[model samples]
Target chain A: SGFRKMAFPSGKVEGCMVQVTCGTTTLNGLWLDDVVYCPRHVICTSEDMLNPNYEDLLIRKSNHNFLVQAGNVQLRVIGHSMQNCVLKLKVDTANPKTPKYKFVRIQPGQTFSVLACYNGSPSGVYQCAMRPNFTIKGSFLNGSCGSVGFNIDYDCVSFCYMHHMELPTGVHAGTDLEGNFYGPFVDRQTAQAAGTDTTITVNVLAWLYAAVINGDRWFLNRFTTTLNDFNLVAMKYNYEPLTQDHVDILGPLSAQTGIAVLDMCASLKELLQNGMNGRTILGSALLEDEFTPFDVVRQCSGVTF
Target chain B: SGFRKMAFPSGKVEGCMVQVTCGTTTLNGLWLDDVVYCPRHVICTSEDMLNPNYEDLLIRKSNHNFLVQAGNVQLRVIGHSMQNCVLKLKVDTANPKTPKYKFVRIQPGQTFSVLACYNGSPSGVYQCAMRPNFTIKGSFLNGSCGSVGFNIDYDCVSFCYMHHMELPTGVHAGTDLEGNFYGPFVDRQTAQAAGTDTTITVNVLAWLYAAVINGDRWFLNRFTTTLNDFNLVAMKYNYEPLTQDHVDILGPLSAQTGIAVLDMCASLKELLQNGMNGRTILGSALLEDEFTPFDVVRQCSGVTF
Candidate 1:
């Protein structure tokens, strides 16, 4: 059973694993199969090769869509980064996994030309010169990824799921519903004081989900808990709250126990840090409606943030 | 210059770029002045290192839940590839870089143990043994990205946008309001006809967008044009169409007439192949909104799907 098969989308397959042995070893060693290998450049983007771990991932956010694209799928930047920002353009000319000198350079807020001229038609067979940007751009500098996710971890994947909800930034919306903030502004010390990031995000996702259904009593209780957690954190870090004029600022947050969903994003990124089990749970539970047509209410039912 | 300035989250910036000198160049040469380099793993997902361009990029769709993660801030797979897949898990020991063997291996659809003992809290400075899995899997052989975009070029980004719509595979939601069938069942030959990929996607994205809000008579008129285009394409390439065996094919497709918003993805990528300005036109005009909200009667508005 020493057979390996590879299918060709082009319905073309060539070569085989020839034997290379010494003495009676009777084992398959290094044999470069005759199959044409997919070029790395075509298989990978520049930074994709230079910074495989997704370091210096471009950061894109709502209200501020700074992403750019060109020549259909030629070269596009989904977002941008602050430091060591290594952007890439998909042009054909600079082939062979890339000479590295084939990247094109563009400023953060600027647009540049990306061209690709192909010959022949999709009818028979054609080979495009990829004469695109053999011209060039900047090489990537490995760096930290956009420093926030639904969880606020540097490797944030919040957008992956939040993108699912058709709702806009709204009270009942998940991450982006009411506006998922990027690089959320907060007093670092206070958030880092305890498990504030953890505690807050959990409250917000559930709170907002609950908000739409008018869970008044539940809403009010959560408000109190959130505020208590906040005040305690603020006091621990010796930080000031948004308002010190009042001793208890829970009411000031506009949580009327009827309107205003707790709108913070910590739980988003916080929600999945539990890893695979957590991820699978979130992935499987596709939210069907505001509330199920069914009215059975489990205590944790409202808690599935 | 032994001062490293780390920016605190509260709009705090307390550092400067110090430079090193070389001959009369008095420039930053091997300068180790005051700074901190961003962590790479926290930014990259290992295969992220193996593949950057999102090439042969895994097309992990709904029902398939395959992302894995670990380390408060380390490598993780957002999803999985397939019988042909390359996956990795993050472990952060032996820093400054890594010793690749930190990945774990497993078969398809199976879950396994991933451990990372973090020292610091989510609040303060943290370090984990990075002991997750160096055991990696797969050697990405297939190339050219998942293929198409609005370009439908194989490295198709339409799926990217479609993934954004939160709709399951369906006929033009443009046509069906409740839902649309995805993986639209089309005759293989018709689907594969030259440049048909480009044509169909354009039709789908646009046709569906139009069907959404109810523009009936207007919807009927557009179908004639699209069917005509399909016929012309068929005549051009000798293909067959639906047999009378399926008479109410239109009824099952659930098409409706509506405001649709002309959702052809605005991104008909095979675009520039048409060349220049229109190419440049598509190069710009990024789509915003779950669907930009505004109901002013426009011609293309009637042309929505």
Candidate 2:
């Protein structure tokens, strides 16, 4: 009569210890065998049994498909979009409070093998719409980037009033054409005078942009067909509603951009149904919900009286 | 009853000749008694009712709040939109199986007075988004407009080699420093032995951009300040399922764009709802019906696999 059906968040708990208790009975481990490893505050066999291992808790396995090594996972991103630069890949995460993601910009001829490494091993879900980057001498957030062709700073500003003899041949003051700085200048007797001027700028999806722009792979026949020596781009903005409005409008006006944001608890609950099964975007037996307004749209309407 | 109300579509009915059925023995000239002028098909009993005004139909009366000249009405439109690049003023009939509407570009500086005449007296309704246009020799659907800064045709060819070193001025051409052409290219051509190319790149809500680009004041200014010339823009698109993915994730994205479609219907509906309506965005009798979603949302729960 009591051969009951059991369920587990981790799919029918196993390889763990259990216990029965009543109002403070010195519990187990007075010396041996009654042991368990759990992260949640203890609860079990009726009257709240203890979770024996406090510090070294139950190990969490990967929830979604990801490449793991030791502690966390690696999520590799690869896709194409146009600025059709339509969304080559769409992002659906279990966390909405995480970073606000913009579609990553890949160079003209770039392809897969998108991410080389992780900034951190995010255990939530690993994925991205990535861009490429290169370096320059300045602020990576908000600074002016100048070139002979364009000057667009979008929602921010870029002020420039630079003065220098301009060391074009790598700081010929001492260094080669390598873009590195030459050392200190020498001074004799008749005193000296000077003034200081600070410089700023920003890069990345970094080395990839640098390599492509620097005409680096010419010897390998790969880069000879690319736009050589380009400038760096640092992303800067405040994504609070208004800023997002432009992209919401301009994103499609220019490129293929579709990003999705979803609530976590809901996504988790959904995974459990359909057999208390495994997880994946598709293939496993299950149908995802059809879309409606509440899912990916959030913003104010236009006002014109 | 205090709770009773009735409504009708027109101001009043009039002008058609009358008739009395019943294998009638005709006698308009012989009928006796007195009567006044009327226009229905015989619901009267008297004479002088037979003033045979043959050619014309019901002497039309004015409807709603409009400035009329004998038979037509003049509607003055005024307002502002944020991107207030705000709309394409997409037109739709009471039915979907209607025609397509191209964008009507508004001139610079000119705000309302967006429509001067009607396609027909559409007691139906009106409003919308607007685009900017600068005439150039090119594709009507999609083409890049270059400057004579040069006369150039791009991507989708303009099948031309515009050689006449001239530009017209006015929405009407073959004419001024206005956008029209200096027509009547002479037959003295055999004597003149000349060749020419016509060019046109057609933007800036017209008045608005013309102000920035042409800096035209005195000549183009008078008509420019007025939306004297404008066309109706009909909205067209497929708001189908993911086959767009986002509605398949931002159904609201294109819809908000489309809802901006039916302005006149809403405008008319609102006009009737309140004599009490604008600077407040024609606000209030504010019988707003919100909290409707909850009616559907209230009794809902998740489904499992």
Candidate 1's DockQ: 0.01
Model 2, A6-73: lDDT tens digits are: 00011001101112111222111000111111112111122222223212321221122111121122
Report per-candidate DockQ. 0.01, 0.01
TM-score of each: 0.18, 0.13
lDDT of each: 0.19, 0.16
Local error of candidate 1 at B17, Å?
37
lDDT value for candidate 2? 0.16
Quote the lDDT for A122 in model 2. Answer: 9
lDDT of 1 by residue, B193-290 (tens): 11121111222233233333322122122322234444444343223332222113223223433222221222222221222222111111221111
Model 1 Cα lDDT, one tens digit per residue, A61-175 = 2212222111222222232222221122222222222111111222111111111011100101010111111111111011101111111122221111011011111111011
